[PDB]
Swiss-Prot record:
Induction: Expressed late in the viral replication. Substrate binds at residues 32, 104, 117, 132. The gene is E. Optimum pH is 7.3. Keywords: Antimicrobial, Bacteriolytic enzyme, Cytolysis, Glycosidase, Host cell lysis by virus, Host cytoplasm, Hydrolase, Viral release from host cell. This is Endolysin. It comes from Enterobacteria phage T4 (Bacteriophage T4). CDD domains: T4-like_lys. Disulfide bonds: none annotated. GO terms for cellular component: host cell cytoplasm. The active site is at residues 11, 20. Its main location: host cell. InterPro entries: Endolysin_T4_type, Glyco_hydro_24, Lysozyme-like_dom_sf, Lysozyme_dom_sf, Phage_lysozyme-like, T4-type_lysozyme.
Length: 162
């Protein structure tokens, strides 16, 4: 198990524009297209992202390319953010994957606001951080994905994911 397989399990793969859990136009492996309600704003964003007229549909390759970009951007965002970086540096390899997952899903900005959890993670207070992370809209809106990430953060193993 690695960050790529972990996220591919949590987001799935869809080759056709679809709506995410929040109602946003998305494609491939959790690649958000637009928060706008228009399906044309979404196909426009898509063609821009792919470099071709897609008519809302893409190949496996295309989806994986977007995915590679997005994990990369997630990682680079963490390393650039003054609140995230120190947490990430302090963690072990499994736990780092989970932090990435948390960022991919929710933006640097959002994760960076999880102030208290961040401080607990850094102090390696696992059980307590798990308890705090669960008191969030995040957990309440996507509880099974959330529990898997939290478990990874708590344990430091890939158990939730076998
Ligand atoms: Cl893009
Ligand atoms: Cl879920």
């Amino acid at each position: 198990m690695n960050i790529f397989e972990m996220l591919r399990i949590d987001e799935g793969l869809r080759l056709k524009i679809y709506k995410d859990t929040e109602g946003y136009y998305t494609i491939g492996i959790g690649h958000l297209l637009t928060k706008s309600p228009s399906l044309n704003a979404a196909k426009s964003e898509l063609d821009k992202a792919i470099g071709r007229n897609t008519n809302g549909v893409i190949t496996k390759d295309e989806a994986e390319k977007l995915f590679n970009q997005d994990v990369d951007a997630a990682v680079r965002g963490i390393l650039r953010n003054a609140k995230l970086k120190p947490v990430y540096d302090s963690l072990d390899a499994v736990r780092r994957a989970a932090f990435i997952n948390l960022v991919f899903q929710m933006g640097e900005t959002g994760v960076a606001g999880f102030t208290n959890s961040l401080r607990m993670l850094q102090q390696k207070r696992w059980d307590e951080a798990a308890v705090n992370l669960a008191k969030s809209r995040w957990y309440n809106q996507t509880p099974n994905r959330a529990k898997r990430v939290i478990t990874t953060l708590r344990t430091g193993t890939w158990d939730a994911y076998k």
